[PDB]
Write an enzyme that holds these catalytic residues in place. Structure first.
Site, short mmCIF file in Angstrom:
data_model
loop_
_atom_site.label_atom_id
_atom_site.label_comp_id
_atom_site.label_asym_id
_atom_site.label_seq_id
_atom_site.Cartn_x
_atom_site.Cartn_y
_atom_site.Cartn_z
N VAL A 4 -15.04 29.55 19.55
CA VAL A 4 -14.40 28.56 18.62
C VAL A 4 -14.85 28.59 17.96
CG1 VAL A 4 -13.37 26.52 17.82
CG2 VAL A 4 -12.60 27.54 20.05
N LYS A 5 -14.66 29.29 16.31
CA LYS A 5 -16.11 28.80 15.21
C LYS A 5 -15.69 28.40 14.57
CE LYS A 5 -16.25 33.91 14.59
NZ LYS A 5 -18.48 33.66 14.81
N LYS A 44 0.25 18.41 15.76
CA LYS A 44 0.99 17.91 14.27
C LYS A 44 2.63 17.66 15.02
CE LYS A 44 4.84 20.60 15.36
NZ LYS A 44 4.67 22.21 14.71
N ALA A 57 -6.41 39.29 22.63
CA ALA A 57 -5.46 37.79 22.90
C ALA A 57 -6.31 36.68 21.73
CB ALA A 57 -5.19 37.08 23.74
N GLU A 83 5.48 20.88 7.33
CA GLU A 83 5.39 19.22 8.29
C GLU A 83 4.23 19.06 7.83
OE1 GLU A 83 7.07 22.70 12.23
OE2 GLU A 83 4.61 22.30 11.03
N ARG A 92 4.09 28.83 -4.50
CA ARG A 92 4.00 30.14 -5.01
C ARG A 92 5.31 30.86 -5.23
NH1 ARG A 92 0.74 35.44 -2.45
NH2 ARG A 92 1.22 36.99 -4.78
N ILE A 142 9.12 31.24 -2.86
CA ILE A 142 10.28 30.98 -2.11
C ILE A 142 9.52 29.90 -1.20
CG2 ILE A 142 11.46 32.38 -3.09
CD1 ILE A 142 11.80 33.85 -0.02
N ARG A 194 9.71 31.48 3.47
CA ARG A 194 9.74 32.78 3.02
C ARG A 194 10.32 33.73 4.81
NH1 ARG A 194 9.24 37.31 -0.21
NH2 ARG A 194 9.08 35.79 -1.33
N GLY A 198 0.27 37.91 20.85
CA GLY A 198 0.42 37.01 20.82
C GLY A 198 0.01 37.46 19.27
N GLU A 221 27.02 18.00 19.49
CA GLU A 221 28.64 18.43 19.55
C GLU A 221 29.23 18.81 18.72
OE1 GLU A 221 31.12 15.41 20.03
OE2 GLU A 221 30.32 13.38 18.53
C1 LIG Z 1 -0.08 24.38 12.45
C2 LIG Z 1 0.28 24.92 13.45
C3 LIG Z 1 1.54 24.41 13.77
C4 LIG Z 1 2.35 25.32 14.98
N1 LIG Z 1 3.19 25.28 15.59
C5 LIG Z 1 3.99 25.83 16.40
C6 LIG Z 1 5.40 24.63 16.87
O1 LIG Z 1 5.43 24.42 17.16
N2 LIG Z 1 6.02 25.58 17.88
C7 LIG Z 1 5.49 26.89 18.43
O2 LIG Z 1 6.10 27.80 19.22
N3 LIG Z 1 3.70 27.29 17.69
C8 LIG Z 1 3.34 26.79 16.14
N4 LIG Z 1 1.91 27.48 16.30
C9 LIG Z 1 1.92 28.48 16.42
C10 LIG Z 1 1.23 28.50 17.92
O3 LIG Z 1 0.04 27.80 17.49
C11 LIG Z 1 0.75 30.15 18.07
O4 LIG Z 1 1.10 31.16 17.99
C12 LIG Z 1 -0.34 29.81 19.01
O5 LIG Z 1 -0.93 29.45 18.88
C13 LIG Z 1 -0.99 31.58 19.49
O6 LIG Z 1 -1.49 32.35 20.54
P1 LIG Z 1 -2.83 32.76 20.93
O7 LIG Z 1 -2.75 32.92 21.46
O8 LIG Z 1 -2.14 34.51 20.31
O9 LIG Z 1 -3.66 32.54 19.61
P2 LIG Z 1 -4.92 31.28 19.81
O10 LIG Z 1 -4.29 30.47 20.31
O11 LIG Z 1 -5.41 31.61 18.36
O12 LIG Z 1 -6.21 31.54 20.82
C14 LIG Z 1 -6.56 32.61 20.20
C15 LIG Z 1 -8.42 32.40 21.03
O13 LIG Z 1 -9.71 33.30 21.28
C16 LIG Z 1 -10.32 32.88 20.03
N5 LIG Z 1 -10.98 33.92 19.92
C17 LIG Z 1 -10.95 34.74 18.78
N6 LIG Z 1 -12.03 36.01 18.57
C18 LIG Z 1 -12.42 35.78 19.38
C19 LIG Z 1 -12.98 36.95 20.29
N7 LIG Z 1 -13.88 38.10 19.54
N8 LIG Z 1 -13.86 36.55 21.73
C20 LIG Z 1 -13.58 35.26 22.13
N9 LIG Z 1 -12.48 34.56 21.57
C21 LIG Z 1 -12.04 34.49 20.20
C22 LIG Z 1 -9.87 32.70 19.61
O14 LIG Z 1 -11.35 31.45 18.48
C23 LIG Z 1 -8.96 31.35 19.81
O15 LIG Z 1 -10.00 30.07 20.38
C24 LIG Z 1 1.49 26.30 14.87
C25 LIG Z 1 0.56 26.90 14.66
C26 LIG Z 1 -0.23 26.01 13.85
C27 LIG Z 1 -2.20 26.56 12.75
#
Ligand SMILES: Cc1cc2nc3c(=O)[nH]c(=O)nc-3n(C[C@H](O)[C@H](O)[C@H](O)COP(=O)(O)OP(=O)(O)OC[C@H]3O[C@@H](n4cnc5c(N)ncnc54)[C@H](O)[C@@H]3O)c2cc1C
Ligand SMILES: Cc1cc2nc3c(=O)[nH]c(=O)nc-3n(C[C@H](O)[C@H](O)[C@H](O)COP(=O)(O)OP(=O)(O)OC[C@H]3O[C@@H](n4cnc5c(N)ncnc54)[C@H](O)[C@@H]3O)c2cc1C
Lengths: 482, 482
Positions: free
Chosen positions: A37-38, A61, A153, A197, A214, A216, A219, A321, A465
């Site tokens: 995590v950067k 959230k 991922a 939200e 910007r 709609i 979207r 993902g 309902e």
């Molecule tokens: C504010 C917000 C609200 C959301 N609300 C909802 C909701 O209510 N319901 C819902 O279903 N989804 C929601 N989401 C969407 C959801 O959080 C994402 O769809 C989900 O977390 C995606 O999972 P992921 O595994 O693909 O990616 P991530 O969880 O982002 O995981 C990727 C990880 O890999 C790390 N990484 C990246 N590159 C590298 C690398 N080179 N080497 C090692 N590690 C790396 C990243 O830093 C991160 O930790 C929300 C997202 C946001 C930001």
């Protein structure tokens, strides 16, 4: 057959990566999973294992949305005879501490769970050396590891506009859920579910958001439903700056943020001062640090195109993902695709991920949940004349005594007009939208028709309902207000 | 159309009667609908048109449940950082006033709508003269009207135990929802959903209920879930008098009520003092006043057996709703059956009421919802070795920050073990149980299998998505607590 350090290396430890890593080991693979995590630039926010959902997404959230709903509950309680005081105010810092206390409990559990499941968790940044080789950069040092198979991922991170003051003076959702300072008067740039939200629970917690759009609202979502969500936010005293784009942000002598902005239709240039500027203008996939050209993997801007088995164009490299091109970017989608992918690799399964009719919820003050097609997509797909829309406004039982507006309590079923009158899409604005819609998503997967829907006996008194009570069609032209 | 004063006379102006009357006029019938409300004996509570749901049932019960929930929301808000005060108390007189105020508005809109739709509303007590003739007793005189067809939709009224003091000192749900005096310490005799719900909101509003149980809790419900409901209420400070039955009630000099009672297992005799004795021991159909023998209609104790078109043994006389023998006693059942009946009589429809897999919710402090078979009925019907039960304990996201007990947050799916793995039954205890179960009930009516269920993507974060996360079978013997 060949022999590498691992059967499987997963790059990224959020919803998909972890689901994938765990399901792979369950089925006897030798697996590593990298996560890193950067920190946010400026401010430098960082966090623990488990990715976006837990740390800077769904979970905080939902918790702040709950904080905001509880305020309203405190207000409504008086209408029912409770002797509650009216001048109540949220302590932002206690709220943030509560939420972060939860997330760090989760980070620990997750970390322990991985070690217990024997998933080898590496805290480093992975980049490809070649289609079978990965360099991990560790807090101090590096490892080079090989695998038979790689699951990418890595998800995305929030975008910043290309404008002066953007990164020095604005924040994103990464910062918001642990903000040291109170949000105060806040400008929320972006009207996707994240911006909405955010503005929603800011107003509900006593701050003053304005939403900048910007073009709609929401979207990709049904635009009737969209506009109803926006108007319901304006009803709640959240202003909107329509057809308007940020120009720059500068810090004033008094530490206030001066944002100049531009109407994109008229050309009109304006300005205002805010305490906080939140960019919620989209999320860019993290392909950049991967060095995908070393591995031969084709990229589509910031995302990776995959086949229905989540294979990239390189046979042994998969992606799952958020980094994936053109699929629902949601947590349960990442999780389930991650797991199924491990199961086909190692558990002898052939079950592919199903991405159609994924339900979702926008957790706006009045929440909007939907599953299936928007009205316009169904009409584009099949023809206006082969579509039926059943609709109505309704009144939650819980709204009468406190006299809460029912102006935006609206739901609709989009369906095949003849034949089996197959249901294509369901849309609802109101309380507990996601609780209501979840079972209806399961119904749509079991082939729900209009006849079944309308002959499912209601549970009374509920707002769910209302879906079973649907009767007025848009085609009839009859008033949808009972 | 020829000989009688009406095409249709409907006896009963509640859920079934009004839905029948309204649909009948929509399809061109000349209709009258009789309604009369007998005042409670002692006390003399009485109310307007619309029947039990509106006046003494679903609606006030849901409103007082909401008042109790809002009380809990107030206490939770503090955990999130709201600066709410702890010492809050509800005002019973103010709550009764807001509830009755809503019900009187609905009585009036209902009356207006009947007139607007040309259903002739007669405020008079109907009894049969013959199978085509009814005597109507009005406040003024008597009428005497004839019709081609009769629909009996008279429902029931609460039962009183045959015990000294019962009618003089006891009350029922008919009195409760407009009680002039504060409940205080209250013995709730009966542990169906009415008793449990009343006990639940009374505790939540600051009173001290005790539930007296003759035999079992929630007879007719999944018994595992019944015991989890009882225990969640004991967790909230609500006591149960098990295997216990009332013997008498008397009024002491000080105005309190002395209740003599007996344990029916041990023979133990006990007594206690209460401010209120609520009898919630069942409801008796109102066949008595109809003079059915004049019409030649056969009865089955207090109820009327009907065929699958709701016909009695007299082919021009139907019955619908609560008075009907052996069917779910719920508002939307009464409404849909009365509608479909009028639509077959006058609308050229052949669609019969479907009484199977009706969903219901018990609105106890923690709500229990269900649709389809209990576990024991599925085992009974198919054999243990043909049943799969998926179950789990879960944790609502909203329960974390205020540290609310998750001890009773439990759901399960009762399913066909092999083959298509059809879901037979779904059960859930937790928040907004009826909102969650409604869509799943439509799913069931569409053929929901386990594979569909488990591969419907969750909406995250919701408690409803716990259904789609179900994985641990009772047969595995694995811990249902992650
Ligand atoms: C504010 C917000 C609200 C959301 N609300 C909802 C909701 O209510 N319901 C819902 O279903 N989804 C929601 N989401 C969407 C959801 O959080 C994402 O769809 C989900 O977390 C995606 O999972 P992921 O595994 O693909 O990616 P991530 O969880 O982002 O995981 C990727 C990880 O890999 C790390 N990484 C990246 N590159 C590298 C690398 N080179 N080497 C090692 N590690 C790396 C990243 O830093 C991160 O930790 C929300 C997202 C946001 C930001
Ligand atoms: C305390 C309680 C809580 C409940 N909670 C729920 C719940 O949340 N969800 C749910 O779905 N259901 C609930 N119900 C059940 C629901 O109220 C009933 O199933 C429904 O009201 C039955 O409708 P009906 O038309 O058959 O009867 P009613 O509503 O009882 O009948 C209408 C009327 O006929 C009148 N009448 C009787 N005899 C005559 C006569 N001879 N001449 C003229 N008029 C006559 C009666 O006085 C009455 O007005 C609850 C019921 C109670 C009592």
């Amino acid at each position: 057959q060949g022999s590498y350090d691992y059967d499987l290396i997963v790059i990224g430890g959020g919803s998909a990566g972890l689901a994938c890593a765990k399901e792979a080991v369950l089925n006897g693979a030798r697996v590593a999973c990298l996560d890193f995590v950067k920190p946010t630039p400026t401010l430098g926010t960082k966090w623990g294992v488990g990715g976006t959902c837990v740390n800077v997404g769904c979970i905080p959230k939902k918790l702040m949305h709950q904080a905001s709903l509880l305020g309203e509950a405190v207000h409504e309680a008086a209408a029912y005879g409770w002797n509650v005081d009216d001048k109540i105010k949220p302590d932002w810092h206690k709220l943030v501490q509560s939420v972060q206390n939860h997330i760090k409990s989760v980070n620990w559990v997750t970390r322990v769970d991985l070690r217990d499941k024997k998933v080898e968790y590496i805290n480093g940044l992975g980049s490809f050396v070649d289609s079978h080789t990965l360099l991990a950069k560790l807090k101090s040092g590096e490892r080079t590891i090989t695998a038979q198979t790689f699951v990418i991922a890595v998800g995305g991170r929030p975008r910043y506009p290309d404008i002066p003051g953007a990164v020095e003076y604005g924040i994103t959702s990464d910062d918001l859920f642990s903000l040291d300072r109170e949000p105060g008067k806040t400008l929320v740039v972006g009207a996707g579910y994240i911006g909405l939200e955010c503005a929603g629970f800011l107003k509900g917690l006593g701050y003053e958001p304005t939403v900048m759009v910007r073009s709609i609202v929401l979207r990709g979502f049904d635009q009737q439903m969209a506009e109803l969500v926006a108007a319901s936010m304006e009803e709640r005293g959240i202003p909107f700056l329509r057809k308007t784009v940020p120009l720059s942000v500068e810090k004033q002598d008094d530490g206030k943020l001066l944002v100049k902005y531009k109407n994109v239709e008229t050309g009109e240039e304006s300005e205002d001062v805010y305490d906080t500027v939140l960019w919620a203008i989209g999320r860019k996939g993290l392909v950049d640090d991967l060095n995908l050209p070393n591995a031969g993997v084709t990229v589509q801007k910031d995302k990776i195109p995959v086949d229905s088995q989540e294979a990239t164009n390189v046979a042994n490299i998969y992606a799952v993902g958020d980094i994936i091109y053109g699929k629902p970017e949601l947590t349960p989608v990442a999780v389930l695709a991650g797991r199924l992918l491990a199961r086909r690799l190692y558990g002898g399964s052939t079950q592919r991920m199903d991405y159609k009719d994924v339900a979702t919820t926008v957790f706006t003050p009045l929440e909007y949940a939907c599953v299936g097609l928007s009205e316009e997509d169904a009409v584009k797909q099949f023809g206006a004349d082969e579509i039926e829309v059943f609709h109505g406004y309704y009144k939650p039982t819980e709204f009468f005594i406190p006299q809460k507006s029912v102006r935006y309590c609206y739901l609709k079923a989009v369906a095949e007009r003849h034949g089996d009158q197959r249901v294509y899409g369901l849309h609802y604005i109101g309380p507990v939208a996601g609780e209501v819609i979840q079972g209806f998503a399961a119904a749509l997967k079991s082939g729900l028709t209009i006849n079944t829907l309308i002959n499912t006996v209601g549970i009374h008194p509920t707002t769910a309902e209302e879906f079973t009570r649907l009767a007025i069609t848009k085609r009839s032209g009859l008033d949808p207000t009972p």
